[PDB]
Amino acid sequence: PSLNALVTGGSRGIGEAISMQLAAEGYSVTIASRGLEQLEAVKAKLPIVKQGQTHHVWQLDLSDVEAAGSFKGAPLPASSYDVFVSNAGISQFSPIAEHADADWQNMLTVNLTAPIALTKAVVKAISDKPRQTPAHIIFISTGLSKRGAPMVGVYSASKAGIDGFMRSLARELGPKGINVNCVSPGVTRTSMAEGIDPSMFDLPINGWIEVDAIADAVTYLVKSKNVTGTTVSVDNGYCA
Amino acid sequence: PSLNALVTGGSRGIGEAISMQLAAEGYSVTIASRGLEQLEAVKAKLPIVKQGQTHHVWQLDLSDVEAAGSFKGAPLPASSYDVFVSNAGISQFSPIAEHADADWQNMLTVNLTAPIALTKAVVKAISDKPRQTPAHIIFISTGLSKRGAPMVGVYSASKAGIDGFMRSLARELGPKGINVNCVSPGVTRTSMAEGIDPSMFDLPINGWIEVDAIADAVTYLVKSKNVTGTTVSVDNGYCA
Amino acid sequence: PSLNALVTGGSRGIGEAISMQLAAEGYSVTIASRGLEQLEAVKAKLPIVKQGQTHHVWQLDLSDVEAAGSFKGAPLPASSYDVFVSNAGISQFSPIAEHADADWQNMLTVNLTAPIALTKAVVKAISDKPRQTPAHIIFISTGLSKRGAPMVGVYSASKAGIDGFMRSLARELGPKGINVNCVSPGVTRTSMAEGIDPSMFDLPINGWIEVDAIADAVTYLVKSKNVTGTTVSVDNGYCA
Amino acid sequence: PSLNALVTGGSRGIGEAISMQLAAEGYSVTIASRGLEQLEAVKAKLPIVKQGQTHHVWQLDLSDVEAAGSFKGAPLPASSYDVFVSNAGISQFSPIAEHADADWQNMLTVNLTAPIALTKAVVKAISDKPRQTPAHIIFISTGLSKRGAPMVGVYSASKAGIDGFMRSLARELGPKGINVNCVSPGVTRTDPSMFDLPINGWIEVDAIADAVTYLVKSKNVTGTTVSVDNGYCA
């Protein structure tokens, strides 16, 4: 019986790769973000490997906190999900003194406030459902959340925020059969990696990480039962 | 002359205790909080130990990001401060499912959004002033930011956000002669740690932490020059 | 081509589970420990799934630093290995005051000194060999290396030492095509966690962790290419 | 009334700076180290500021685990101490492949094995002594124990080992009135261009002693590291 996964930012980059992997594994994947044409294009490519497995699109403005918390427009009830991958995020680089208020505040809402609201919505809906195997909530974070760099003050803040949220949720939700973790990418070949590149950081493994490396970590977590409250870092050694 | 320190949440508890020690060390202290009456009382209490040391109040609503970012109502120029202690915060305890949106959203604002704004104003105003000794920006975090607990989801996220902000600022502002750190209190005796008490945690050292011990850490940091990107944990071993 | 994996402490519990899983992936596995009969029984069970895949035993006293350092008695030279999993270790519980000297010194040797020698030999043998994909060095650590508990002082030291070794080696060897990581199990069903059980720790996920859960993280790492200098924690939330 | 503090490696660099500052605060400092001539020079200059304060030297081979363990040749019994600062340690830089076995084994012994033995002897002697404020056990670690760099494999291991010891001890001994912490220096004058540092330059020894002193006067800090590393671990 195909389990349901929700992947925000599922239409591109890391989130696409995740959704593709979870679909290959038999998960009924809902992919959520803004662009309806992009979502549909990914949904067509999602493998269907088990009978009764169905994919879905959710046109969701990732910066609208009330939409996320109300789960507005979603193809399924929040209570349907056994996997939620919060991959939703924006990156911005700037010295803090020059960081435009509309920008950093938007970044904070996309990366932190909205996922909090989404997460509440999911947990309320699935907490007391019977299980036998844990549900999983997995956030995509970043090496910058744990090892500081110049010019990413607010970016770093938003995703360190997510790390602290994960750790507390893990403790709270563990007794309810929900496991909660982060996957922390380094510099990965995507957009929002537009501008930044690997040679800007002191990496033990030089060069780009491909998107499928980050999805391998998500898949590993989804299949696991005794991992909660952790980060799986896929960063070419940035945080070493 | 006597260096200027700004301390938000300075009108009671930890921030009062931090302002008292700073005054005692000769700092001219600006104290900011919503409650003008409580502010004026604290101001009257602050030691005056050398000539040309002067203290001030700043009625500042800690939940107004715009006000905070514009230094609105401030009694001195943002450029005057050589020490900024971002002590402002709210703590709320709730299962995440049951956490009222208005409550957790105000908490994030007070604990993270507004301090970012306020930090941006200070950094903008002081980054270029010349120094032979570092200036200091010190955030007050919590043990819960690094070691997860039930029922403190958003609280933990806000303060781990501050931790992430801190590390990245430390990197960015280091070569500018600004040192950036956190002090992380455990369960401290304040009308603030309300209902929740030391027995509720696994603690190597039982009992309450007095506000003066938090202030001790801040004072230590203010007088240091080679300490940046770090947390001083005063938590009775909570994070051990 | 079948790659060679060396797995110390390979004869039971976690080590046996890792060896079984690597063999099922097509690795030629060398399992090394003191007890020959147990060794041979495990070897006989290792899957043989492809051409050119051979398994071996290496009777090695994991307390003998010189023998580890010189590959004394080993069936293949150090230069053969693309994977080295250091699972070798002893645990002991005692208040520090009462921890008998011979015992804790022997634990230090088995858990830290001998693996450092073993690692030195692998690294010196394989460092200049050419590689398209990275070689892997993986240490088995413990949640206790990162979160403190009573009565495990020297045990925690030994395994934290391993963690510290891992991060530095990761930086050192990354440019040589060798990825270095820890897997950190929690309380795991083995005749090794003797005396100690899960109930003595504050765990979000109650109960014993099965040896396969630890092997799964090892297998994940071995199949990856962009993970280095990290820990993968499989601890039912102990470190959360 | 002046309390006894033990500071190993107390004759040079960071240890001397620590011995000096503790002496300035009222502590009777016993300093332990191999170099007996330098021990006396430093004992000669330690501040006297409190009635009854008296300083001591202890000739100790910091590699002799058994002498550490048994307080061999010490001027005071282990029971006398309310503060123990483990400053004791050797650093060595080498590719792991070329790191001489006698060198790295001896570093491990000095940095880890012998400090465990010493800690044991102290904890055994003081755990049951009544206390109004807590005793202190403070290890000197290094930024490299938490953040990896090349060519410092074993050194990093030895000092992360200390960190792991510190965290368990802090949980074990907190109920007995013993607080246990690390101070983690960066590159301290005793090179900084090796590392990515938000603050450029050397750290002076007194900045490390400042941390120790802060720890010593505190009551509610245990299980932690105070990092004075110019931002190395940021």
Author numbering:
A (entry chain B), B (entry chain A), C (entry chain D): 7 to 246
D (entry chain C): 7 to 196, 203 to 246
Can you quote the paper on this entry?
A large subset of alcohol dehydrogenases belongs to the family of short-chain reductases/dehydrogenases (SDRs). One such enzyme is ADHA, an alcohol dehydrogenase from Candida magnoliae DSMZ 70638. This enzyme was isolated for its ability to reduce several ketones with excellent enantioselectivities. ADHA is a homotetramer as typically observed in most SDRs.
The purified enzyme crystallized in many conditions and the enzyme three-dimensional structure was solved in the apo and NADP+-bound state at 2.0 Å and 1.6 Å resolution, respectively. Although heterologous expression of ADHA is good, the melting temperature of ADHA is moderate, with an apparent Tm of 43 °C. If stability of ADHA could be improved, it would become a very attractive biocatalyst for selective oxidations or reductions. The obtained crystal structure of the wild-type tetrameric ADHA allowed us to predict stabilizing mutations through a structure-based computational approach using FRESCO. Because the energy prediction algorithms Rosetta and FoldX do not accept non-proteinogenic residues and because the ligand-free enzyme represents the physiologically more relevant form, we used the crystal structure of ADHA without NADP+ for the stabilizing mutation predictions. The calculations for the 4503 possible mutations were ranked and mutations with a ΔΔGFold ≤ −5 kJ mol−1 were briefly simulated with molecular dynamics (MD) simulations to probe the flexibility of the variant.
